[PDB]
Amino acid sequence: DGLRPGDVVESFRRGIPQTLLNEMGGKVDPAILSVKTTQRGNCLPISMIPIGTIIHNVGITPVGPGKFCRSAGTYARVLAKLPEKKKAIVRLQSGEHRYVSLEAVATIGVVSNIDHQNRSLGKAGRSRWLGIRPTVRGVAMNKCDHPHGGGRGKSKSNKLSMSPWGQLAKGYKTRRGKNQNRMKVKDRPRGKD
Amino acid sequence: FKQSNKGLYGGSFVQFGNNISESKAKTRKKWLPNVVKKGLWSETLNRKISIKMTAKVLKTISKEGGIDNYLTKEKSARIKELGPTGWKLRYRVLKRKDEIENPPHKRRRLMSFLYPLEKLEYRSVGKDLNYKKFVELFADVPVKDILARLEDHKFDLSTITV
Amino acid sequence: KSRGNTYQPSTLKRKRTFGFLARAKSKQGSKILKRRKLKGRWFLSH
RNA sequence: UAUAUUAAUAAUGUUAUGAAUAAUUAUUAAUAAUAAUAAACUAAGUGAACUGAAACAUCUAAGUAACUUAAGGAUAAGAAAUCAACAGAGAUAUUAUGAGUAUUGGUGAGAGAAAAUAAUAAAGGUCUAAUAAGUAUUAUGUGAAAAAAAUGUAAGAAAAUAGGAUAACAAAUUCUAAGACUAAAUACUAUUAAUAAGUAUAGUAAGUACCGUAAGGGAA
RNA sequence: UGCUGACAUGAGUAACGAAAAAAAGGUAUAAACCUUUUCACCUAAAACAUAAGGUUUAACUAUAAAAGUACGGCCCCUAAUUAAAUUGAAUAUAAAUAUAUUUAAGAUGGGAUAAUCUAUAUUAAUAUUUAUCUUAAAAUAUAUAAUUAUAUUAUAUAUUAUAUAUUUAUAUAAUAUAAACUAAUAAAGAUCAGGAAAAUUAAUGUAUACCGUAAUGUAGACCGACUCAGGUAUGUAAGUAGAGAAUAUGAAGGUGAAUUAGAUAAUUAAAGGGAAGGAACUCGGCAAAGAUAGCUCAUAAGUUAGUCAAUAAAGAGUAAUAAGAACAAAGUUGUACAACUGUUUACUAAAAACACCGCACUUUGCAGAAACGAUAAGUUUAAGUAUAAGGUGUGAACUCUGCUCCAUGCUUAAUAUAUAAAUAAAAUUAUUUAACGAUAAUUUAAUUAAAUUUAGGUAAAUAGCAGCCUUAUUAUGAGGGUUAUAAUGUAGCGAAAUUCCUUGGCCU
RNA sequence: UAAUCUUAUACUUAAUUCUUAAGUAAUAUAUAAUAUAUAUAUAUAUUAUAUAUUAUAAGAGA
Ligand SMILES: [Mg+2]
Ligand SMILES: [Mg+2]
Ligand SMILES: [Mg+2]
Ligand SMILES: [Mg+2]
Ligand SMILES: [Mg+2]
Ligand SMILES: [Mg+2]
Ligand SMILES: [Mg+2]
Ligand SMILES: [Mg+2]
Ligand SMILES: [Mg+2]
Ligand SMILES: [Mg+2]
Ligand SMILES: [Mg+2]
Ligand SMILES: [Mg+2]
Ligand SMILES: [Mg+2]
Ligand SMILES: [Mg+2]
Ligand SMILES: [Mg+2]
Ligand SMILES: [Mg+2]
Ligand SMILES: [Mg+2]
Ligand SMILES: [Mg+2]
Ligand SMILES: [Mg+2]
Ligand SMILES: [Mg+2]
Ligand SMILES: [Mg+2]
Ligand SMILES: [Mg+2]
Ligand SMILES: [Mg+2]
Ligand SMILES: [Mg+2]
Ligand SMILES: [Mg+2]
Ligand SMILES: [Mg+2]
Ligand SMILES: [Mg+2]
Ligand SMILES: [Mg+2]
Ligand SMILES: [Mg+2]
Ligand SMILES: [Mg+2]
Ligand SMILES: [Mg+2]
Ligand SMILES: [Mg+2]
Ligand SMILES: [Mg+2]
Ligand SMILES: [Mg+2]
Ligand SMILES: [Mg+2]
Ligand SMILES: [Mg+2]
Ligand SMILES: [Mg+2]
Ligand SMILES: [Mg+2]
Ligand SMILES: [Mg+2]
Ligand SMILES: [Mg+2]
Ligand SMILES: [Mg+2]
Ligand SMILES: [Mg+2]
Ligand SMILES: [Mg+2]
Ligand SMILES: [Mg+2]
Ligand SMILES: [Mg+2]
Ligand SMILES: [Mg+2]
Ligand SMILES: [Mg+2]
Ligand SMILES: [Mg+2]
Ligand SMILES: [Mg+2]
Ligand SMILES: [Mg+2]
Ligand SMILES: [Mg+2]
Ligand SMILES: [Mg+2]
């Protein structure tokens, strides 16, 4: 959010650098790592991030890149750490608490462009510029096409809300059964707000 | 069934047939063999062979005492069962077995000594001679006569050393 | 609008998509090349 | 740059600085490559629908059309784990009687053997295996309209003192699976000869002219 | 409505396909061919150069001339993309084949030298689009180092006179119209954030390959059955006048046609004018007519504050006061539908239908949802990560979106619960052997799910939102009672594009 | 968890290059012995024997 040209940020995925290593007497002994541990911009393994910190660019594996909370104004909160199991509970922006490997990359802060969601295009042409083509509602289709089509006048055909290819689009969970996320503490709030 | 050529399917094969409902309606279906990727150990190759095999052949391998015995069965049935991949492997197992059992000695140096003499002779008459041609020309010669050089030994390529 | 002018000539496209090599370098192309030959046609391809 | 490269030589020019050295001319040894190559017949995989059932789904059409793959002048099959019945035959292939016969079917439409006797047929039996196991068999899903042989998953023997064959059992009979080669009678193409109650719109042109972008259609 | 061939009738009828022609001579052979003159049409083309295409149709067989310097291809390099190509065993797949990586091919693109003309080879070493604004200063006009106004903001090469290596090059100083326009750096505004790929020196070397080149190319020379009023890419496109490539003429060029010559009946098409009325026409102002600046001022109500309205209507300034080319320029208002610009039925419907920005619901934690894959590897999603992507409905914005999950689904919790497959063991039975035995079905034996059921939630999911009696003296019912349902039509609007009765009652 | 599954990256002989083989160089792993230091155990060093010259790292896991 607050990054500006001039600030200094550093990465500690390899670990504590040499400068602090020779400064252990005045750096680690007083535990003034907290000065740099919770700072906006620098990236730490979730192991060194204190509980409750707001973080983004969250990975899944120790040798993997950040994958979660990269979009505009997105953030995640670290909830718990489990040294024995080498897993950490990371509250995630969708609201789903997910297990993540302790030594997973994490950048502190929220992501920039908070007010992106408040933007508003003014004309259809604007969208076209970004590569968004028109979407035709099923109701306007014909029966051969989207199931909702057909019928004289405006009518939904007493057909449930379905995708063109025959999949319910209203509250139907696609991921079901064996092929489910093996790592999740609590489901994301379905009602959300 | 070209997928079989890449593994040891033991003659297994796909079957195309019908499915029957209680109304006796007929619709086509395929029967695919149970293919499993397994890495077995070869004693003579001293390394783990890893190919796709069906479950039936794996059980047959267990009863026959390893891949090596499976791939070296004389009975014709086995030859048919072993696909292209099995044939090539059989060659490996058998050739390696012969090499261990039959050492070369139960010439390379001689040709090394002979080469400089012949190249000089060819250069003297204005021609040339390269090693590859030297091997090609003198590949089938059983005994190299002592025209030059000295036989300061009694080897005869037999009973090396004392 | 007016029709009938569907064939707009172009030597590059005509040769690239109906030429001899456009058919001699493919399984399906070769098949129709040999079918025309068996029928005895003089002009095998473009 | 195969009128080529490397090497050697004779000479020239010729750098280099007598010799060398490459460049060239000319000889000799070595180093290297050219896929249009048919169609039909055979075998294997996958495999429809129109149609018939006076509708239609089991069934039929049909393992046909079509696509794909491989080989030879042919290919396939072939010397019984075959038939048959208490008496016997003795490989394979094609045709006739057997026979529209047993057998089978929303017991509808329909489908339909074998034994045995004849004809063509060629010398027609003969070892090439150390005699065959995840094999026979069982359960299960498939699988030639009657007649099985095969196959997906898994379980799984015996040694001629044994094993296969029939709903099942007891007798009896017959054969030996998990190893193999095999002419001839057959199919297709081409050539020669003979015979045409065959052809001049099935009598030689031309897959041309022309139509289509193309597959393709196609005259006088 | 048979197939093929030949010949009739319609019938010497319709038609000969945007059009300006005339005389003289080639030629006592010409409307149609050639030449000369006159007239006319096209002229930001019907002209001149080109691209693609094509029976070479051309000014023709004696025929379209390239080392390169504005000459293109060829050649180097790649984009989109393509590939019987490459990778005991790259991955997958009944065959066909598909996927990923490499390699190769592929212009619609990029490629130093050059009129003071230039030299490409071998060896060796080490750049999306877009504008030039304002201040300043010089210089100029009226006024007095001050002030008002004004062309210019940067380059493009000639002449004169001087200094350098010495009449070849550079530098200096002075002189030299306006309006367009060209390529190069400069400077700088927006988000829609703007291609890929292939070095320098030193020496030596260059005997300049092949192909394109005619003419037509807004058309008689290509695609359209035709010497077809249709379709076809690029640059100049004289001047005069204009804001202008509009409109008027036309210098030069080209051109004036496989139909001609007479009267132009009724009638048809395209145009010009029309008295007195001026929509009475007609389903309906369909058609036609209507322009008092084109520059400079001025310009209301409403309103989402946007000269949106608006090019506002009327009006004013510039010679016009009877008129005299062409083009640009054609009023005001109410209502219904839709926010608006846009898209749609090639060839009868352009709209009120599609899209739209906006709103709302929902799935997916990335080893993901969605889609494709005889079916998989795998690909798009995305080199993205819940403010992202997929699906659904509504469709800018002001005031709002009341009620109910009964039914179809969705979703959470309950072993409450039946059933298929898979298995051992063990009892009766049946067939057979004389016997143990062999073969068959039957039943008992603890080990099950999803499903189903029950109870919730979910309507901006699919959906629904009733009926009778009578109470304030004459009317109605604020109100009172009645059946069952999950709910029982809230705000708003109302003879609606929703109203048959209906041309509903009243007003303009 | 060596069930499965996903992700990333030297000399010498015998048959110019390739391969086998006895010996030894260096790395890694495992066992036995010796010595040292702490509370029978842990850590380090030396000697000997055996194997390797598809692996390493991360994740899911009966
Ligand atoms: Mg529609
Ligand atoms: Mg449908
Ligand atoms: Mg046509
Ligand atoms: Mg194409
Ligand atoms: Mg029928
Ligand atoms: Mg059949
Ligand atoms: Mg077949
Ligand atoms: Mg044969
Ligand atoms: Mg045979
Ligand atoms: Mg018969
Ligand atoms: Mg036997
Ligand atoms: Mg069975
Ligand atoms: Mg039949
Ligand atoms: Mg036998
Ligand atoms: Mg044609
Ligand atoms: Mg007739
Ligand atoms: Mg008439
Ligand atoms: Mg007439
Ligand atoms: Mg006429
Ligand atoms: Mg005349
Ligand atoms: Mg004009
Ligand atoms: Mg002009
Ligand atoms: Mg021209
Ligand atoms: Mg290339
Ligand atoms: Mg080009
Ligand atoms: Mg030309
Ligand atoms: Mg020209
Ligand atoms: Mg024309
Ligand atoms: Mg044409
Ligand atoms: Mg003129
Ligand atoms: Mg012309
Ligand atoms: Mg004409
Ligand atoms: Mg009048
Ligand atoms: Mg009048
Ligand atoms: Mg009227
Ligand atoms: Mg009237
Ligand atoms: Mg009008
Ligand atoms: Mg106002
Ligand atoms: Mg106008
Ligand atoms: Mg209204
Ligand atoms: Mg609209
Ligand atoms: Mg519009
Ligand atoms: Mg239309
Ligand atoms: Mg219209
Ligand atoms: Mg949108
Ligand atoms: Mg999916
Ligand atoms: Mg969305
Ligand atoms: Mg709508
Ligand atoms: Mg709205
Ligand atoms: Mg609406
Ligand atoms: Mg509502
Ligand atoms: Mg059961």
Side-chain angles (χ1 to χ4, degrees), chain B residues 37-50:
Chain B
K37 171 86 144 193
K38 200 74 174 155
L40 308 182
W41 172 266
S42 163
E43 53 254 33
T44 166
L45 300 175
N46 197 26
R47 84 188 174 71
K48 293 221 301 183
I49 186 168
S50 69

Side-chain angles (χ1 to χ4, degrees), chain A residues 49-68:
Chain A
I49 290 301
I51 285 305
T53 317
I54 299 280
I55 69 138
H56 62 78
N57 269 302
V58 193
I60 305 100
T61 49
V63 286
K67 300 209 158 199
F68 302 147

